[PDB]
């Protein structure tokens, strides 16, 4: 499992490089901390119009102006 690895690195380095790159491409998106930021950036990219809501009277988490405190903020994206 180690002498076989040295043998296949001696005979066929192309397939060893291919299986190593493919194995890292499989495992490393889960072992990474920055993978969640890909999800967050792709879900915070505004392709549509943010259709507003009628104010029924009791919605504390929804702002009234873009320059309000509450609302989803992208301080993490500006700073990183």
């Amino acid at each position: 499992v180690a002498a076989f690895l040295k043998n296949v690195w001696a005979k066929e380095p192309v397939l060893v490089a291919s299986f190593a790159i493919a194995g890292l491409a499989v495992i490393l998106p889960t072992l990474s901390p920055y993978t969640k930021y890909s999800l967050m950036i792709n879900r915070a990219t505004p392709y549509n119009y943010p259709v507003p809501l009628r104010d029924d009277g009791n919605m504390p988490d929804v702002p009234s102006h873009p320059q309000d405190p509450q609302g989803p903020s992208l301080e993490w994206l500006k700073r990183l």
């Binding site: 493919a22 491409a25 499989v26 998106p29 890909s38 999800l39 792709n42 879900r43 990219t45």
Partner: protein
């Protein structure tokens, strides 16, 4: 519109250069020549290996046709599913390549 004009101008320049290349030395009255290669009168034998590499091109080209919208699919919200299906398509292209390997399909044009 500009693309169609550009294609038409490229086609016109191509046909003009072909027409000049055929009609300009046919001004010459050089000689009418007679008496018409590694085979003289042999038929063509078919080769199975050339057809195998043509169909291998076609099947991997279909797999590439599936792989083509990946720079657009990177922008989606369901990145775990998108990554799984992208890796699954490239893995199936690799499994098709390994099956082409081990059944001696890539031999004498390896």
């Amino acid at each position: 519109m500009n693309l169609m004009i550009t294609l038409l101008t490229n086609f016109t320049l191509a046909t003009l250069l072909v027409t000049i290349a055929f009609w300009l030395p046919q001004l010459n009255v050089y000689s009418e020549k007679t008496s018409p290669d590694p085979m003289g009168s042999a038929r063509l034998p078919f080769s199975m290996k050339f057809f195998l590499v043509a169909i291998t091109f076609l099947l991997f080209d279909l797999e590439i046709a599936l792989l083509l919208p990946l720079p657009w699919a990177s922008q989606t919200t369901n990145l775990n599913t998108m990554l799984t299906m992208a890796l699954l398509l490239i893995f199936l292209l690799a499994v098709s390549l390994a099956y082409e390997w081990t059944q001696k399909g890539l031999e004498w044009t390896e």
